[PDB]
Design an enzyme around this catalytic site. Structure first.
Site, PDB file in Angstrom:
ATOM      1  N   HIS A 131     -40.755  50.953 -41.479  1.00  0.00           N
ATOM      2  CA  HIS A 131     -40.877  50.649 -40.077  1.00  0.00           C
ATOM      3  C   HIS A 131     -41.775  49.396 -39.996  1.00  0.00           C
ATOM      4  CE1 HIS A 131     -39.305  54.363 -38.377  1.00  0.00           C
ATOM      5  NE2 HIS A 131     -40.002  55.032 -39.246  1.00  0.00           N
TER       6      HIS A 131
ATOM      7  N   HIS B 140     -35.466  43.878 -38.972  1.00  0.00           N
ATOM      8  CA  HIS B 140     -36.707  43.030 -39.058  1.00  0.00           C
ATOM      9  C   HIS B 140     -36.709  41.969 -40.116  1.00  0.00           C
ATOM     10  CE1 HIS B 140     -38.823  45.333 -35.998  1.00  0.00           C
ATOM     11  NE2 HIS B 140     -38.453  46.469 -36.607  1.00  0.00           N
TER      12      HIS B 140
END
Length: 104
Positions: A97, A10
């Site tokens: 996350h 990410h």
């Protein structure tokens, strides 16, 4: 799952992410969507400073985002660039996350 993996999945060093190459790799396995944060790692880690137990946090600042969204052809994407806050799971002072754009 952990901060090393979160950076690989990410965080991007380029805004114009090559979605068709990167999301074809095993880490992403041609999934429908993946959001990347255009930043060096430390300002993204800082979102979680001080947060020990797992907790979802909406960033207090907006970041540059590069989203790869699948087209009608499998594993071929359209890249969309936007600026928004996003929600991450913070655990032991690091993002582990990515939850979603705009809200937890």
């Amino acid at each position: 799952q952990d901060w090393l993996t979160f950076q690989k999945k990410h965080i991007t060093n380029t805004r114009d992410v090559d979605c068709d190459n990167i999301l074809s790799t095993n880490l992403f396995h041609c999934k429908d969507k993946n959001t990347f944060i255009y930043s060096r790692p430390e300002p993204v880690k800082a979102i979680c400073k001080g947060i020990i137990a797992s907790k979802n946090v909406l960033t207090t600042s907006e970041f540059y985002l590069s989203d790869c969204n699948v087209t009608s052809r499998p594993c071929k994407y359209k890249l969309k660039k936007s600026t928004n806050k996003f929600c991450v799971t913070c655990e032991n002072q690091a993002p582990v996350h990515f939850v979603g754009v705009g809200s937890c």
